[PDB]
Design an enzyme around this catalytic site. Structure first.
Site, PDB file in Angstrom:
ATOM      1  N   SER A 241       0.841  -1.188   0.000  1.00  0.00           N
ATOM      2  CA  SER A 241       0.000   0.000   0.000  1.00  0.00           C
ATOM      3  C   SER A 241       0.881   1.245   0.000  1.00  0.00           C
ATOM      4  CB  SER A 241      -0.910   0.000   1.230  1.00  0.00           C
ATOM      5  OG  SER A 241      -0.154  -0.137   2.420  1.00  0.00           O
TER       6      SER A 241
ATOM      7  N   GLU B 248       7.850   7.019   8.350  1.00  0.00           N
ATOM      8  CA  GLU B 248       7.569   7.638   7.059  1.00  0.00           C
ATOM      9  C   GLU B 248       8.123   9.054   6.953  1.00  0.00           C
ATOM     10  OE1 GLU B 248       3.417   7.414   5.925  1.00  0.00           O
ATOM     11  OE2 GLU B 248       3.572   5.218   5.799  1.00  0.00           O
TER      12      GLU B 248
ATOM     13  N   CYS C 277       4.152  -4.770  11.691  1.00  0.00           N
ATOM     14  CA  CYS C 277       3.984  -3.685  10.731  1.00  0.00           C
ATOM     15  C   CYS C 277       5.314  -3.606   9.993  1.00  0.00           C
ATOM     16  CB  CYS C 277       3.704  -2.365  11.455  1.00  0.00           C
ATOM     17  SG  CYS C 277       3.608  -0.958  10.344  1.00  0.00           S
TER      18      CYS C 277
ATOM     19  N   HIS D 143       6.753  -1.277   8.640  1.00  0.00           N
ATOM     20  CA  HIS D 143       7.482  -0.017   8.822  1.00  0.00           C
ATOM     21  C   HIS D 143       8.423  -0.170  10.032  1.00  0.00           C
ATOM     22  CE1 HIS D 143       4.240   1.918   6.455  1.00  0.00           C
ATOM     23  NE2 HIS D 143       4.946   3.034   6.429  1.00  0.00           N
TER      24      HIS D 143
END
Lengths: 270, 270
Positions: free
Chosen positions: A15, A156, A188, A190
């Site tokens: 995504s 991010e 996750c 990330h």
């Protein structure tokens, strides 16, 4: 017997940018495999979205990479894995892997006291996907699931090594440090960027499970199982990234995280 | 998403009794899976036999277990894996695993100095199967392949802990102890019974790779990949052994090696 040399790339869809850590793991564990990656940043996040949307968007990335020539597909994000994996795996002729079972399998194997923890977005946590998978394997496990609301933001924003980061992680994980948890799943993609801080806050006794890294471990086996390996003579000759959003913000993030040379990033439309 | 509970047994076929060590590993790593095993002792050994024979006999054991209801097949012997695996995997609708690639994969991962050794029967050694598999993955590896002619005899005679054993292993492996080998593949499923002696003779620095154990590792992943796992609620309720030869000699050996309770052994005809 007959071993085939297949230099077609392994595909990775996501995504956003979290899936970059799965690619980073693939570059390391599979030095001879070619890579293609698609990040749908133009429609990220997928979490707050309905299942229909997520499945449609995941199919668009899938179709895109299949047409580019992939021999195997890795759905590198929890949300897509959770909602689209089974449908896509059943429909495609190529192997398709997700990022939930490999990490679960790894945790079940690493835990000594059966006190397992998992951190991820509130969406992942609320889905109970990890808890269900863990307990479907070892019901005696005591699973503590904790959502870490701002972790994705920190990563991010490329501030995973800053003071803000260490403060956010320390405070967020505090309640986890008092449950005798010896294994914590990074639920996750990330999160690997925050690993050093997470490790320090959890303590050296806690084993951290990188879901993406474990997923790449399964890929390695599947390449042998399906006779789809590339040869070391060929080596990796291709690594291309595609994003439906800003190619600039992407290449910026990607080069920082992968910490390697110049990366091939291209803006596309789905 | 949808996880299926499949209590059908995992099948294991072998020319003789060596495959019992693979079953021993499955009992340990997959505590909730049911097991069916067939040993074709009435036609053992397969090594000196022509390919046609080996394939026919392997198909007879396969057909037999499929009719008994297996959901996955493990070819637990090097000879059969080498000659019949690909044909059977391509023809059957169930997953089929062999005992050569998993161990190779494991060795490539464990080696630090790229000095890899492999021991097994002269048939296995002469086939060059391991050397080829190892080098198809990492060509810079220095592979030393050594046949150990009497190891199978010692193990099958249940004297794997005797003085004769320690003498045979010490003398046989002597030439291997001077090549800076840091990883040694046990390329014969009979060999785990001699592990303690082999380890002592090779030294603590050498990492021993149990091919069967690694194969069971792949099975664990494939059960998740194909959604074929049994549930922990069911647990293992079935473990049946079949032999085309003396059921007595078999149960005798099996109970010693598995070192557990009473085993269900039945003589059959193929």
């Amino acid at each position: 017997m007959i071993r085939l040399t297949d230099n077609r790339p392994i595909g990775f869809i996501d995504s956003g940018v979290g899936g970059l850590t799965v690619v980073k793991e693939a570059l390391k564990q599979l030095p001879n495999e070619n890579i293609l990656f698609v990040g749908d940043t133009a429609r990220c996040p997928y979490g707050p979205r309905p299942a229909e949307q997520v499945i449609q968007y995941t199919w668009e990335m899938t179709d895109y990479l299949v047409e580019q020539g992939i021999k195997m597909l890795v759905i590198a994000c929890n949300t897509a894995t959770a909602v689209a994996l089974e449908e896509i795996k059943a429909a495609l002729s190529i192997p398709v892997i997700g990022v939930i079972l490999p990490g679960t399998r790894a945790a079940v194997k690493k835990t000594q006291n059966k006190q397992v923890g998992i951190i991820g977005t509130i969406g992942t946590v609320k889905s109970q996907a990890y808890e269900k998978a863990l307990k479907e394997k070892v019901p005696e496990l005591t699973v503590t699931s904790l959502a870490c609301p701002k972790f994705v933001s920190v990563v991010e924003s490329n501030e995973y090594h800053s003071s803000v980061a260490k403060k956010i992680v320390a405070e967020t994980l505090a309640p986890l440090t008092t449950k005798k948890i010896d294994t914590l799943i990074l639920g996750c993609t990330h999160y690997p960027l925050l690993r050093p801080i997470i490790q320090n806050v959890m303590g050296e006794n806690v084993q951290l499970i990188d879901s993406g890294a474990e997923t790449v471990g399964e890929v390695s086996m599947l390449l042998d199982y399906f006779n789809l390996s590339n040869s070391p003579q060929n080596g990796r000759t291709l690594c291309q990234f595609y994003t439906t959003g800003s190619a600039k913000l992407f290449e910026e993030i990607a080069e920082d995280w992968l910490g390697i040379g110049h990366l091939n990033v291209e803006h596309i439309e789905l």
